[PDB]
Amino acid sequence: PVTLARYKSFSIKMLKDMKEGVKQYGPNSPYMRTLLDSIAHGHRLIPYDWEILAKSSLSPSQFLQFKTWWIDGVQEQVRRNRAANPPVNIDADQLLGIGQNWSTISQQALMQNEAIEQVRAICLRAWEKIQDPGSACPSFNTVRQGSKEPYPDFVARLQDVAQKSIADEKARKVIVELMAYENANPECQSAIKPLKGKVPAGSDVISEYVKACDGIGG
Amino acid sequence: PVTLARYKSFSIKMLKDMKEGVKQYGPNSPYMRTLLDSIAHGHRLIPYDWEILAKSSLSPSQFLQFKTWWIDGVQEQVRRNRAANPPVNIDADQLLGIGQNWSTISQQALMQNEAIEQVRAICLRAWEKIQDPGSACPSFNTVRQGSKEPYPDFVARLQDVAQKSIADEKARKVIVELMAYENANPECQSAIKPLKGKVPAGSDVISEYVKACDGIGG
Amino acid sequence: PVTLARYKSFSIKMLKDMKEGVKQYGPNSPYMRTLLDSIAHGHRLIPYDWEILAKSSLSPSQFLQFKTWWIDGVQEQVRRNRAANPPVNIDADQLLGIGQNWSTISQQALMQNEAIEQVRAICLRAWEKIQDPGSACPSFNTVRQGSKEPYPDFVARLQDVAQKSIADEKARKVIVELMAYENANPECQSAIKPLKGKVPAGSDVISEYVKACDGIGG
Amino acid sequence: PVTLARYKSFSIKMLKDMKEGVKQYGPNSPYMRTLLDSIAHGHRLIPYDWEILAKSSLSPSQFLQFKTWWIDGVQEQVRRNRAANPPVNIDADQLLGIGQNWSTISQQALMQNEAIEQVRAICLRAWEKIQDPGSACPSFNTVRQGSKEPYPDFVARLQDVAQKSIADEKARKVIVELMAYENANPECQSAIKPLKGKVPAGSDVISEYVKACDGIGG
Amino acid sequence: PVTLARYKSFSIKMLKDMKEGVKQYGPNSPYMRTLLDSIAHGHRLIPYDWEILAKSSLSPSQFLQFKTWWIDGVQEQVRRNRAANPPVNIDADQLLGIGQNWSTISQQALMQNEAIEQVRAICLRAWEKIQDPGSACPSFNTVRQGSKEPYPDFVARLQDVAQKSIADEKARKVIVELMAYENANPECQSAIKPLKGKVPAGSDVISEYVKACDGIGG
Amino acid sequence: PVTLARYKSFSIKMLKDMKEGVKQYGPNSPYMRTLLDSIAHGHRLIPYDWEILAKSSLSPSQFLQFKTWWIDGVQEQVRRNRAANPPVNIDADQLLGIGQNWSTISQQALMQNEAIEQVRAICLRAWEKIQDPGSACPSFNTVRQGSKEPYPDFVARLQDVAQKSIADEKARKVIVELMAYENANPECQSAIKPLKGKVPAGSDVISEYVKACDGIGG
């Protein structure tokens, strides 16, 4: 990063325990995601650092997948910058680090904050949009609760699989509301009959359910 | 964390152990209970730090419960904040870090002292209210002291559900002993019964209870 | 502790490997006992540090048991201080850290050496007087030696279990002398026939036996 | 340890590895043999330090044997100390740290140089005289070189019992080779026999013994 | 390594992790690929350092292959070195560190800059040309995309054998995509076929290939 | 070692991970051999340091074997120094550290570079000339290749066992050439028919074979 302008390479042990953690819990752990967010906002990065971090971390397949969704995000961001009002004087190759304006490590020491947040958002989104090994064609009406089942651990499996088959943030977050009230057992569904019929403002709909019907055990 | 404002992230070594401890022992070990507030009282945090720390650490089932109770405590707090004398000008989304004025790292570096401790106090209760993924939380009279079982281990199973299900602190310290020998082991209740009301000044009545009950099981 | 007056909190890794060691070998290991003695005499502690150390270490059951025997030791020490010749101007709440003379961390920075050794002896005794999981009603005349059995490893199991069922230091240390000469096999008992009949001074009675009859193998 | 007197304890990290090594290899590995005297010659110790270190580390069966031989060596030492010219004024309980003048940390900070090395020399022999908890120590002619077995491994099984059962150092270096080929493997004794008395100056005769014996087994 | 000449060795901790990583993952993980050149570009090495590092790390089967290709690259390099304009005066055994003038540590401290980078460039290719001890390296048409299998994992199995079997760098970047869909999965080839020649400027054609191929298997 | 003259003892963790590595992979690993070379050339050692390093590392059997081949190397080096032209004014006891010229640690601080390289070569050779547990009488015409066998992993087992039964460097390195061409399967032997009949200069004969016939897989 930069302090007051030079480059400082990372300490070696960070790559070691990062490789350890991704090897143990996959590239889409909730653990390593916020680890990436912490190391992202905690330092001032250039895209070549993102190249070293990505190539130093995964199998070759996930590395190239990261490269591809990075490329598509570059094109999307460039179209939105040219659609901006007024348009943004930021190209694609400044966002990728190829070309005689941005080839070297010393060239990228003099970027600006809009590029910082832009590469931050786009590489974070690139990490969010990776698949993983392990495949099964998902059908929503196959998973349901059982007797004496703890309520949040039931809805957690519905929470996690919802971001797989739906790209839109809104489309996945509306159907979990519907699948929550149906796939609940009727004794827990009995608790939501006043809550269903009046959705409250200043509040997440799932958040009201979990702190509503907590006392159903066995 | 802020300092004298730059937001420095945590170390990579700061979080791998934290991810280790939750799978090794759980979310409410006494070890991580005194580990969390050490960081909370040696540093000075913004709500996005907790957004990092919980999402990096919990399970998907636990993290949703954390987010559920986190926004739930805001409703109890903001009613206290609005009717104070003098009334303070702090709204809902200033707590949650959402909205136009609270969703960047540059924004959250510009907050006063009197917001921070409310975030700490609500986050501690949020961290305490998590359920383990083994089961749900049982009721009060669903669990009592077992037969041919030790005494002081089962009375430890009350203070946790007291901190879980009860808000007021001195209510917790008074419900437990008045639930202690009420459906306890009756052979132990013989020794326990003549000790009622024999408390000198400022001591745990449960202390002399387990002092008396030596243990007969095994 | 204090150097020349401030408070310094402990490093985090000490609690980590302490929790590791007690989890591996129990709270009454010979290992962790002298670890407690080393960290006890190696630093200048206040009772609130003992609270953090105890609560940061065990299951809830052992923590409250520690609290109880701590309380009983406070009462015993207070009775002996009032029985002292002349009596000692040291109360109970100075030894416990509750009350407006001794509530805060900064209040306990100005104690004196008699309180230091008093809290040292009494918390050490509190750790010595803990039980553990694992129960069996002990009967002394059930364990005995066998053929080709190594002599010190035979008497070690008699050494360790002797402090369980007897609180008095003298009563447990006299009966092991008797059980040593009887539960030995006659070929090793043959070696002690000059040693039995004249107990030597300046010497422990078991110590003479072990460096007497070492050469009985097989 | 003392310094320029304050008694600073060891680190917590100083002892966990020490507890690791005894269960990992034993009490008289060559590794901990050179580990112990390194601390003993880089620091300056009181007898209560050894009371800490042994009780933190050994088994209950080992610790009693250590305490047994520790007081046993005092009887051989104090006869040498009383009849010296000039006679030194150091008694029994000054060695053991017991009694009114030697049982506090404030007391043991007030000792001269000429006590310390005697404690070190007696403690090294005490640490050497421990028996492993697998069995007892066999006799001399109970063990000899096995048939179809390597040569130089079994001759290593003599120097340990020499240091165990013999006090005088140059007696140990002369008993071993005069016990070496006396009931060794007789086919190897054919090659060994014409090498007697062929030692030039200041070398191990056993060196040329294992030089000659190439190894026939397997 | 040299400095401002004394040859300082590496740390002991520098190499145990390196020995750990090869048995943990292999000789050409991406992790050690970016680990090696970090040392190679943060330090300045002589050929005897690589003699240390490979022999300390590989298997006996791997180390001989490394030594085999290491001397093999010298023949291609020295023909370039002899016919240059101006011709440089560097011979064979100056590369290999053998002979009267290059086989001591005092000798190799006396070399110029323009030798060093050739050693680095040849050693990287030498480290890349190693075969794993599971099997040998297969041919080109022995392996293609499998049936009911993911797409972008199997195309990763081409760039490695490209770097293995091909010397010229831009030949590698052009052989792979012209071998990509040639015996790939034909149902995927239906979507792949209309994308030929649609490359704007300076991008991976394989990127849009795996962009198109979503994945049908499983 | 020495910097500008004192002695500095090693850090304790170096002995720890050295004992770890030799315990895992034996004293004749390719790993630990170059570790010894790195720590050898990386520092300025005295023979007493070699004593501490050797005694701190192995079983007693390997330690005494090291001592013996050390002794024989002293005698060989002394005969060659007296056979030198002019002879070398370096004795045996300067090379061993016994005697009133070389008894102490402070005495060995003032050696010279010929002694440095002499003790380096001779202790390295002492480590090379150790046997190990695990015995089997070797016969060369028992091991051969199979179908689809990877060629370098076949010859690696012939490479490693060749230094066991032959002490001469030339005698073992000539017979592996013969056993290479015979014990190869005829399809790989088919590749060497132009290479057999003209051995190339500036090249190792095995090195040409491995980079000749690499493409025989299956």
Numbering used by the authors:
A (entry chain A), B (entry chain B), C (entry chain A), D (entry chain B), E (entry chain B), F (entry chain A): 1 to 4, 23 to 236
Question: What does the published report state?
Answer:
CA forms the capsid shell surrounding the viral core that protects and transports the viral genome and also interacts with host cell factors that are necessary for trafficking, nuclear entry and proviral integration. Further, we assemble particles from HML2 CArec in vitro and use single-particle cryogenic electron microscopy (cryo-EM) to determine the high-resolution structures of four different types of Fullerene shell assemblies. Our studies of HML2 CArec show that an ERV retains the ability to form capsid assemblies using the same architecture as exogenous viruses.
The largest structure is a T = 3 particle, resolved to 4.3 Å and contains a T = 1 particle within the interior, although no fixed orientation between the shells is apparent. In the T = 3 particle, there are no inter-pentamer interactions, instead each pentamer is surrounded by five hexamers. These non-equivalent contacts are accommodated by relative shifts of adjacent CA monomers reducing the hexamer to three-fold symmetry, consistent with its location at the icosahedral three-fold axis. By contrast, when the CTD–CTD interaction is with a hexamer, the CTD shifts away from its NTD by 3.6 Å, the R143-mediated α6–α7 interaction is lost and the intra-hexamer CTD–NTD interaction has a structural conformation and hydrogen-bonding configuration that is comparable to that of the D6 hexamer. Measurements of the radial distance of the centroid for T = 3 pentamers and hexamers show that pentamers are situated at a higher radius than hexamers, 143.9 and 136.5 Å, respectively.
